[PDB]
Amino acid sequence: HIVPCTISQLLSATLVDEVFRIGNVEISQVTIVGIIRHAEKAPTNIVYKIDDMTAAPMDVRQWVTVVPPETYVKVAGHLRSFQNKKSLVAFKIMPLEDMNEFTTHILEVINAHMVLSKA
C-alpha cells in the first residue's frame, strides 16, 4: 500500500538488492508532509527541498506552477536512492488547505508504523 512516513524514517530505510525496507517491510510508495524550504525549477521538472522537522530536508523531484517556499504540502511518491543519498520522486504534491491534515499525518505515521512493526 502507501505508507505515511517521516523523513527520519525514510533515511533509516535499508537498501538491499533494489529493495528498501524499514525492518522487514518492503516500502516503496509513501507519503510525507512537510514545508517547502526551496524550489529549483527546470524545464521538465522541479526539485523541492521538503522539511518535516524530523531530520534535514529531503529532495523531492516532481516531473513537469511552482509551489512557493514556506508552504506546507503533502507529497505522494516513491523512495529512490543514488550514491547512498535518498530522495523522493513525487507523483503528487498537494499544498494543504486544512492545516489539521498536517496533524492527522503525524498520527497516521505513528499508527502505520506500529502496525507494520509487528508484521
Binding site: 517521516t6 527520519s8 522539511d51 492545516m99 489539521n100 496533524t103 503525524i106 498520527l107 505513528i110 508504523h113
Partner: protein, 118 residues
Amino acid sequence: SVDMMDLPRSRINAGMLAQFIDKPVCFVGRLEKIHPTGKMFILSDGEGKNGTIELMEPLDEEISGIVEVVGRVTAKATILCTSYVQFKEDSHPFDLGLYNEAVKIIHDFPQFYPLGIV
C-alpha cells in the same frame, strides 16, 4: 552558529521546555502578545500554557493566529527563534488541542516517530 535546519527539531509544548534546554525545537502555539520592541513574543500551546519566543532582530511583520517557531531552547527555557511561519487558517481553524495530543503521542511512541536517524 550551527544550522538548525539541518538537524532534527523536536515538536514540544510549553510543559516540555525545561526538559529541552539547549535543544533544537519546533513550538506551535497561538500568538498571545508581542513585546513593544518586537523582539519577543508569547505563544500559548494546546494546553493553554505559555512559551516565550526571542528574536535577534525585531519582527518585520505583524503576526497573529497560530505560529510555528523553530529555534533552540535557551538557558532560561525561552526559545531563541531562527525561523517561523504563520499557519494558514483561512479555510479551516487549526485545532491546537488535537495538535497537543499529537505532540504527546510523538513523545510517548518515539519508536514510531524518530528524531533523526534510527
